[PDB]
């Protein structure tokens, strides 16, 4: 199996050795990238298909279940159906059994795959705060008060996990900001509509360039949201670590807020549910307030969301939604083409 096995082991290794999100973003063995390349190889040489399948299955089946979670989204992705058809059910049983075991030790269990009403029976107060985005806006902590946090979710919607996150938020009257990506929106428009219907803010996150190529990436995610909903909030998040002064100026000209964050979840890193809750809550406490970075495409984030929300409440934190001061801004984005 050596090249496929080497790449599988490399994904796991790089995920553990990365010190930051940006470093992990720099990996050459990101599972999404690995499977995009395998789909291409599979397409272009039919003589290699059966051996790719047997090898991929053997190498993924060799992983400990917790490590296998790194590849879960690729295994679930119907685009990869032919690659994993030989072992999909078995792999997903291993991952599902892992999250079953993880759930046992939680006082407020969640479930990313099915609709569960958690044990949460509290309600965060409404707390929506307006920001003038007409000549842009740079958010790090978002100008919120002590013990206020803004929950933000990148790269969705996912076909399953986002709805679990929505259920968790709704149960406790929490609102959030979603920075959707074009690819996810095109795959899952009905899920995006459910996010919209639950009162959340929805902007975009680009994913990869010359200035014009980068600007086109900024427009494209915004356009995808707009094409589904008839609006897109004037909020945008760069590809992590982007420093371009030109793109920052562009956003201001285009009356769109630029959202960074100050509270890391590290939810990109394979880890136990326990570890993830500990890291994100330690960072909430360390910072005291601000903007939290989650990914609604990360299963484990959906699994821990009810528990996370209960701990925010227990710890005296309140959830804030940031939104444009101009309620019409979402219908008149300078990043989208009408009609
Ligand atoms: Mg505004
Ligand atoms: Zn992202």
Numbering used by the authors: 23 to 230, 249 to 379
Task: Quote the passages of the study that discuss this structure, keeping the authors' original sentences.
Bdellovibrio bacteriovorus is a small predatory bacterium which enters the periplasm of Gram-negative prey cells forming a transient structure called a bdelloplast. We identified two related genes (bd0468 and bd3279) in the B. bacteriovorus HD100 genome whose products had homology to one domain of the peptidoglycan deacetylase PgdA of Streptococcus pneumoniae. Here we show that both genes are expressed early in predation and act upon the GlcNAc residues of the prey cell to modify the prey peptidoglycan structure. In contrast to early ideas of solely stabilising prey peptidoglycan; the modification caused by the Bd0468 and Bd3279 GlcNAc deacetylases targets the prey bdelloplast peptidoglycan for destruction at the end of the predatory cycle, and without it a “ghost” of prey- bacterial peptidoglycan and some membrane remains after Bdellovibrio predation.
We obtained a high-resolution structure of the secreted, mature form of Bd3279 (encompassing amino acids 24–383) at 1.5 Å resolution. Bd3279 is comprised of two domains, an N-terminal domain (NTD, amino acids 24–126) and the catalytic C-terminal domain (CTD, amino acids 127–383). The NTD forms a compact structure comprised of seven regular and two 310 α-helices, stabilized by a disulphide bond between residues Cys79 and Cys109. This domain approximately resembles a “cap” over the active site of the enzyme, and has no precedent in existing peptidoglycan deacetylase protein structures; indeed, the sequence of this region appears to be unique to Bdellovibrio and its close relatives. One of the active site loops of Bd3279 is at least partially disordered, with weak electron density for amino acids 229/230 and no interpretable electron density for region 231–248. The CE-4 ×2+ catalytic ion binding pocket is present in Bd3279, co-ordinated by residues His227 and Asp177; the third superfamily-conserved ion liganding residue would be expected to be contributed by His231, which is present in the disordered active site loop and thus not modelled in our structure. In-line with homologous CE-4 domains, we have modelled the ion as Zn2+, putatively arising from co-purification as no exogenous zinc was added at any stage. Unique to Bd3279, the NTD sits over these active site motifs, with residues Leu43, Val44, Trp46 and Glu47 projecting into the substrate-binding cleft; such proximity may regulate enzyme activity. In total, the structure of Bd3279 confirms that deacetylase activity is likely to be attributable to the same conserved machinery of other, previously characterized CE-4 enzymes, but with unique flanking features (obscuring of substrate binding cleft by novel N-terminal domain “plugging”; extension of active site by disordered loop) that currently appear to be predator-specific. Domain closure appears to have affected the position of two active site motifs, given that His231 and Tyr280 are in orientations incompatible with catalysis, yet we observe activity with the purified protein.
